[model samples]
Target: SLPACPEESPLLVGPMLIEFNMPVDLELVAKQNPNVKMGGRYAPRDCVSPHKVAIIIPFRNRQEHLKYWLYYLHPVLQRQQLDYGIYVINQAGDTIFNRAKLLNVGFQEALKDYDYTCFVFSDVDLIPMNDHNAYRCFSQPRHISVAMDKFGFSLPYVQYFGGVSALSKQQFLTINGFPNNYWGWGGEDDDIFNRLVFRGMSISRPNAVVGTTRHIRHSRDKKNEPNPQRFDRIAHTKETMLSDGLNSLTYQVLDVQRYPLYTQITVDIGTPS
Candidate 1:
C-alpha cells in the first residue's frame, strides 16, 4: 500500500558528478537499488507522489554510455523522490537514427503502462552534475541541461534545447510532439522550440549552477550523420507542424525489457524515405 502523502517527505540534497572512468557493474548496481521495478520503473512505496514521470532515452549502439547513465541516473532519480520510470527507447536496426520519432514512441508507450503526466527526454551521454536540478516538469517546457561541459559550461546558443528536457502531458500534446522526419540529430531540438513558440508557450530553465551537467565525449555514430535537409525542415516547421508529429508517429516495438535499474524498450522506428 502507498503512503498518504509522500510528497511531504523531505527531499534529499546532494552534489552529483560524473567520472567517465567510474567502473560500472549492473549486478552490483542492482544490489544497491532493490526497489526499482522490473522494467526500470519506481514509485515511492512509502507515499504517493504528486507527479508520475517517465525518463525517456532514445538510444542505439551506445551500450557503454547506457551503462554509465543507468549507474548514475537511477540513484539521482530515486533521490529526487519523483514517481518516475526510466525508459530506454532503443532504435532497432542500422537505419538512419530517427531520434524525434523514438521519443514520440517513448511518450506513447510509457503511457501504456502508467498515467505519466511528465516526460523527460534525455540523451544517453548526458548526466546531470547536480541532483538539485529536478527531473519533473514545470509550468512551461523545462530545459534541464543549462550548462553542459561540452559548451564550456554555458549554453551554446539561445535556442539550444538539447540534452535533457521535460514536458507536461498537455504541453507535449499541444505541440503535437516532435517532428518524426528529423532522422538525424541537429535540427529536431530547434524544431521543438519552434513548436512551443508557435503555440504561445515559453521554455524555462533552472539557474546554471543547479542545471549544470556533464556530457560523455564520443565520436558520432555512422548512422547518425547530420541531416542535409535539416535547415529546410526547420524553415518549414510552421507549415508542417500540424500534420507531422505525434498524431502521425509510426513504429513497431521489438522488445520491452525491465531491468532492475531501468526499462529498455527496443523499437523498430523504420527507414527514412
Candidate 2:
C-alpha cells in the first residue's frame, strides 16, 4: 500500500497549463513523459504514496480529448506524487454509451492489475487546471471538478458530482458503486450523488480556485445523445440504486491496449432499451 501525498507536495496552490485547442499527438505526449511505466503506472521513488489510486476515464470515440487529458493530467497527477495508474475505459461498438456502466466496469477491471485503494471517475473531455485538487480520495466522496469553463467556470448547480470525483474502496462499495442503467449522458452523476447522500455520506469539495477544469469543446457523441430518461431515473435513484449499481453490473472487455501513458480497456456494455 502507498501513502497519501503531503499537503505541500511541491505544486503549492498553482494554476496548471492546459490548452484545449493545442495540437497534440498520442506519441508526442507519450514521448514527453518517460518516467511513467507501461500501463500508465507511476509512483514516487523517494517515498511511498498512501493510496494506490486509479484514474478511470469512461471513453468512446473522443481520441482527441484523451490526448489533451494525458498531456496535462500526466504531469499534474505525477506532481500529486501519487501511486496511480491511468485507465481509459472505452465503450465498444456503435451502441448507446453508458458512462456509468463502463466506470463500474473500470473499477473491477482496474483491480485485476492492482488493488487500488482509491478510484477517480473522470470524463475524457474534462481537464483540471489546478494542481492542488490532488485527484485522490479523502474523508468523504470528493467532487474534484468544481468549476469548468463550459459552465462559466462555475458549478452548473449544487450537488453536481459530474466531470470528476474520487471515492475510496470502502466509500464506493458502501454506495453500491454508480448506477449501471444510466445508458446515456445525464442522470448518472446525480444518481451517484443521490447514492452518497442516502448512505449517510456527504460530498467534500475544493474551492473553485483549486478545482477548476477546462471542458474540451466537441459535438455530442452520436450514440450518446441526451438521455430522455435522465430526470425520471434521477427521481427514482433511491429505489433503482440497490438493483442497478456495481452489485448488478456486468460487461465484457472487448479489448485492452497498454500504452506507456495509459491502459485503454474497450468494453462491450450491451445496449440501451
Candidate 3:
C-alpha cells in the first residue's frame, strides 16, 4: 500500500539555507527515495493530489548543476505533496541556446504523456532555500524564486521573472507562451512578464523570507552569450508577441531518456538566423 501524504503546510516556517558543499551520490539518493518514478515523476501513492504538475527545465550541458538540482528538488517537491514530474528539456548540439523556445517545447512534450494542469519553468542552477515555498501553481502566476543570494536576498527589479516560476495551463495558453525569438538569457523572462500583462494576468510571489532561494554558482555557458537582439526584442514585444509564440513554435526531438531522477527530452532547436 502507498504511504499517506505528510500534513505539513505548503508555506515553510522560515527560510532554510542551502549550501554547495554536499557531496552528490546519485546511487544513494535513488536508494533513499525509491518511490520516485523512472522518469523523475512522483505522486502521492495513498491519495490523489490536488495539483498535477510538470516541472519543465530548459537545459543544456550542465551535468554537475543538474545533479545538485535533482538531489535537492526531488525531496522538496515530494514534501509539498504534489503529483509532479520532472522534465529536463535539453537543447541538443552546438547551436545558440534558446531558453524560452525550449520551454515552449517542454510544455508541448510534457503534455504528450500526462494531463498536467500546472507547469514550473525552472533554471537548472537555482534551488529553493526552503521547501515551504510550494511548487504548485496558484490562482495567479507564481514566481517561486523570489529572494536569491545573488541579489543580496532581494528582488533585483520589479519586472524580473527569471529563475523559477509556475503557471497553470490556462494562464500559460492565455499568454500564448514565451517569445521564441529571445535566443539567449536576458529578454525571455521580461517577455514572459509582458505576455502575462498583455493577457490581463499578474505575477504573485511568496514573501521574501519564505520564498528565498540559492543558485549553484557557475559562469555562463559559451553558447549562451547575451543576445544582441534582446533590447530590440524587448522594445518590440508589443508588436511581435502575439504572432511569434506557441502557435509559431517549431522544433525536432532528438532523443528522450528516462532516468530514476528525471526525464531528459533532447531536441534540435535550430540556429539563430
Candidate 4:
C-alpha cells in the first residue's frame, strides 16, 4: 500500500505525493481541454503533442453535409495523431457563394485564435475516404484527396484542382493567399494553382490510392454559376492574386464561436447582384 498524501490524512489512503505531483488525475487535466480523451472508442491512451492545425472549411447552410464531414473527418484526423481544430467559416446571408472570398475569410479568422502552421482549405461537402491522409503543413503545397468518387476517383486533368489542399504558413504567404475577385466557384482553384506556379512552388498530391475521397452529395447553391471568363481570369493569377488576395480583403464577420475542439465563424457577405 502506498503512503497517503502528505497534505491529508494517512489512514484515508489519499493520493501519494509523487503521483499527485506527477498529474495522476488525468480526468482533471482532460476537463481543462475536453477534447482530450483517454482510452477506448478510438485508441488506447497515449501521450501526443497536439499539432495546431487550422481546418479552414468554407461553408453555408449544408448542415447535413457538415454532419458528414464531422463524422468522417474528425476520426480520421485524430487517427493521424495531429493536434488540430476545425473552423467552419460559414458565409452568411444570400451571397453569391464566392468560394475564394470565404476561403480568404477562413485564413484570416483561423489565424486570430491559434498559431496554426498549416491550413487545410476544404469544401464542406468533400470527405477523405482514407484515414492515412494526414493533414499537416509541408514545404510544398499538399493536395489531399486528389482522387474523388465524384470524378471516378481520379484526377480530372493534369491541371485539375480542387478537393482538400494544404499549405504551410510560409507557402501560403508566398503567393499572398488567393484572389478575392472570383465571385463564384470555377476559376478560383485554378487561379490558386497558377499562383503556386508563379511563386516557384509546385502542388503536391497524395498517391491516388491514398487520396481517394467520398463526396457528400448536394445540389449546387444559387448564384454559383460557371464563370464565362474563367480562362481569362486564370491567366491573370500572378498579377491579381498578390494585390487582390485575401490579405487585402473586404467583408464583415457576423458571428464567431468556439465549441469543444473547434471554432466557427459566420459572416454576412452580400450577394453578387
Winning model by lDDT: 1
Model 1, runs deviating above 4 Å: 1-9
For 218-238, candidate 4 gives per-residue lDDT tens digits of: 677886777777789998887
The sequence of per-residue lDDT tens digits that candidate 1 reaches over residues 8-109 is 345656566579887789888788888877877777776777768999999999989988988888888887778899899999899889889999999999
Candidate 2 on 192-224: residue-level lDDT in tens? 999999999999999988888898888767887
The candidate 4 region of ten consecutive residues with least summed lDDT is 14-23
Error of 4 at 233 (Å): 0.6
**Local distance difference test, per candidate?**
0.88, 0.88, 0.87, 0.70
In terms of lDDT, model 4 sits at 0.70
What's the number of clashes in each of the models?
Answer: 3, 5, 1, 1
Better of 2 and 3 by TM-score: 2
Can you write out model 3's per-residue Cα lDDT over 30-95, one digit (the tens) per residue? 887888989988987666677889999999898888888988888878777789999999999987
- Which pairs of residues collide in model 4? 51-83
> Candidate 1 clashing pairs?
38-258, 39-258, 40-262
**TM-score computed on alpha carbons, candidate 4:** 0.81
Q: Give TM per candidate.
A: 0.95, 0.95, 0.94, 0.81
